[PDB]
mmCIF file of C-alpha atoms in Angstrom:
data_model
loop_
_atom_site.group_PDB
_atom_site.id
_atom_site.type_symbol
_atom_site.label_atom_id
_atom_site.label_comp_id
_atom_site.label_asym_id
_atom_site.label_seq_id
_atom_site.Cartn_x
_atom_site.Cartn_y
_atom_site.Cartn_z
ATOM 1 C CA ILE A 325 26.677 -48.744 -15.604
ATOM 2 C CA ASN A 326 23.316 -49.334 -17.299
ATOM 3 C CA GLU A 327 24.981 -49.481 -20.719
ATOM 4 C CA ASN A 328 27.583 -51.970 -19.484
ATOM 5 C CA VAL A 329 24.973 -54.093 -17.684
ATOM 6 C CA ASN A 330 22.770 -54.178 -20.788
ATOM 7 C CA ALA A 331 25.806 -55.265 -22.811
ATOM 8 C CA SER A 332 26.488 -58.082 -20.332
ATOM 9 C CA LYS A 333 22.835 -59.150 -20.343
ATOM 10 C CA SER A 334 22.853 -59.237 -24.148
ATOM 11 C CA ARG A 335 26.047 -61.311 -24.048
ATOM 12 C CA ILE A 336 24.593 -63.858 -21.603
ATOM 13 C CA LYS A 337 20.916 -63.923 -22.635
ATOM 14 C CA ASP A 338 20.376 -62.508 -26.133
ATOM 15 C CA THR A 339 20.236 -64.768 -29.180
ATOM 16 C CA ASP A 340 23.156 -64.921 -31.595
ATOM 17 C CA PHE A 341 21.035 -64.942 -34.740
ATOM 18 C CA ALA A 342 23.781 -66.290 -37.018
ATOM 19 C CA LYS A 343 24.494 -69.310 -34.814
ATOM 20 C CA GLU A 344 20.804 -70.036 -34.253
ATOM 21 C CA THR A 345 19.931 -69.790 -37.952
ATOM 22 C CA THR A 346 22.798 -72.178 -38.708
ATOM 23 C CA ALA A 347 21.518 -74.552 -36.014
ATOM 24 C CA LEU A 348 17.967 -74.337 -37.381
ATOM 25 C CA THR A 349 19.166 -75.143 -40.900
ATOM 26 C CA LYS A 350 21.199 -78.081 -39.578
ATOM 27 C CA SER A 351 18.175 -79.347 -37.636
ATOM 28 C CA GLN A 352 15.944 -79.082 -40.712
ATOM 29 C CA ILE A 353 18.443 -80.991 -42.860
ATOM 30 C CA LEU A 354 18.854 -83.668 -40.180
ATOM 31 C CA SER A 355 15.071 -84.012 -39.867
ATOM 32 C CA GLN A 356 14.665 -84.387 -43.635
ATOM 33 C CA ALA A 357 17.472 -86.958 -43.787
ATOM 34 C CA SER A 358 15.945 -88.939 -40.916
ATOM 35 C CA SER A 359 12.517 -88.851 -42.576
ATOM 36 C CA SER A 360 13.971 -90.090 -45.873
ATOM 37 C CA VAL A 361 15.865 -92.892 -44.128
ATOM 38 C CA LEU A 362 12.680 -93.858 -42.262
ATOM 39 C CA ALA A 363 10.750 -93.986 -45.540
ATOM 40 C CA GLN A 364 13.487 -96.241 -46.965
ATOM 41 C CA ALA A 365 13.593 -98.394 -43.833
ATOM 42 C CA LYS A 366 9.867 -99.094 -43.807
ATOM 43 C CA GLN A 367 10.384 -101.322 -46.917
ATOM 44 C CA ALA A 368 12.508 -104.083 -45.339
ATOM 45 C CA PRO A 369 9.451 -106.271 -44.583
ATOM 46 C CA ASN A 370 8.571 -105.838 -48.266
ATOM 47 C CA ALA A 371 11.819 -107.689 -48.966
ATOM 48 C CA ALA A 372 10.694 -110.214 -46.354
ATOM 49 C CA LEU A 373 7.355 -110.650 -48.149
ATOM 50 C CA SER A 374 9.053 -111.080 -51.531
ATOM 51 C CA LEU A 375 10.585 -114.304 -50.171
ATOM 52 C CA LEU A 376 7.123 -115.746 -49.428
ATOM 53 C CA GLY A 377 5.786 -117.685 -52.409
ATOM 54 C CA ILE B 325 17.181 -99.033 -23.978
ATOM 55 C CA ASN B 326 13.802 -99.795 -25.571
ATOM 56 C CA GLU B 327 15.379 -99.872 -29.034
ATOM 57 C CA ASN B 328 18.055 -102.297 -27.845
ATOM 58 C CA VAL B 329 15.480 -104.453 -26.027
ATOM 59 C CA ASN B 330 13.318 -104.724 -29.151
ATOM 60 C CA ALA B 331 16.409 -105.560 -31.213
ATOM 61 C CA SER B 332 17.198 -108.305 -28.696
ATOM 62 C CA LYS B 333 13.635 -109.647 -28.729
ATOM 63 C CA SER B 334 13.654 -109.882 -32.530
ATOM 64 C CA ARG B 335 16.510 -112.407 -32.408
ATOM 65 C CA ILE B 336 14.679 -114.725 -29.962
ATOM 66 C CA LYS B 337 10.945 -114.338 -30.634
ATOM 67 C CA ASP B 338 10.617 -113.009 -34.186
ATOM 68 C CA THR B 339 10.905 -115.408 -37.108
ATOM 69 C CA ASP B 340 13.491 -115.507 -39.892
ATOM 70 C CA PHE B 341 11.414 -115.319 -43.065
ATOM 71 C CA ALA B 342 14.198 -116.619 -45.328
ATOM 72 C CA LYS B 343 14.906 -119.682 -43.183
ATOM 73 C CA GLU B 344 11.203 -120.326 -42.602
ATOM 74 C CA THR B 345 10.318 -120.133 -46.305
ATOM 75 C CA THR B 346 13.198 -122.499 -47.078
ATOM 76 C CA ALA B 347 11.976 -124.895 -44.377
ATOM 77 C CA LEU B 348 8.390 -124.704 -45.654
ATOM 78 C CA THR B 349 9.542 -125.507 -49.188
ATOM 79 C CA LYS B 350 11.644 -128.410 -47.892
ATOM 80 C CA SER B 351 8.669 -129.795 -45.957
ATOM 81 C CA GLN B 352 6.418 -129.433 -49.006
ATOM 82 C CA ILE B 353 8.833 -131.415 -51.185
ATOM 83 C CA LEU B 354 9.295 -134.013 -48.442
ATOM 84 C CA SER B 355 5.523 -134.445 -48.143
ATOM 85 C CA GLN B 356 5.119 -134.698 -51.922
ATOM 86 C CA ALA B 357 7.874 -137.318 -52.144
ATOM 87 C CA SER B 358 6.408 -139.356 -49.280
ATOM 88 C CA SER B 359 2.924 -139.179 -50.821
ATOM 89 C CA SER B 360 4.263 -140.389 -54.175
ATOM 90 C CA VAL B 361 6.195 -143.188 -52.468
ATOM 91 C CA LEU B 362 3.100 -144.291 -50.532
ATOM 92 C CA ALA B 363 1.017 -144.253 -53.717
ATOM 93 C CA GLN B 364 3.688 -146.469 -55.283
ATOM 94 C CA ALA B 365 3.873 -148.674 -52.160
ATOM 95 C CA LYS B 366 0.139 -149.401 -52.087
ATOM 96 C CA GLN B 367 0.815 -151.201 -55.401
ATOM 97 C CA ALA B 368 2.566 -154.169 -53.744
ATOM 98 C CA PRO B 369 -0.722 -156.049 -53.131
ATOM 99 C CA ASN B 370 -1.349 -155.991 -56.886
ATOM 100 C CA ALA B 371 2.001 -157.713 -57.390
ATOM 101 C CA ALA B 372 0.870 -160.206 -54.746
ATOM 102 C CA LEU B 373 -2.424 -160.854 -56.550
ATOM 103 C CA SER B 374 -0.770 -161.083 -59.979
ATOM 104 C CA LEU B 375 1.813 -163.576 -58.672
ATOM 105 C CA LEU B 376 -0.585 -166.467 -59.345
ATOM 106 C CA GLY B 377 -4.304 -166.981 -58.810
#
């Protein structure tokens, strides 16, 4: 019973390392993409300023 | 909601730099033309004096 209960507890509570590493990689790529898009987006008022004078 | 509210407020309160620069240029040319025309108009009394006597 202890073996079966430990198996159930691992199923419900333990980390699936493959899925979590994939999720971490996806999160890192999304964060880098968002940072790059933010760096690109901060230059729109530069285009606004280019119209002045 | 805050993002959408700021996007809304930009369309009412914030200025359009393209339209405003175009308007400023138009006003500058209008003022220059009116100044030149007034400088030419203040030359009617010299026609009056040179008429005779």
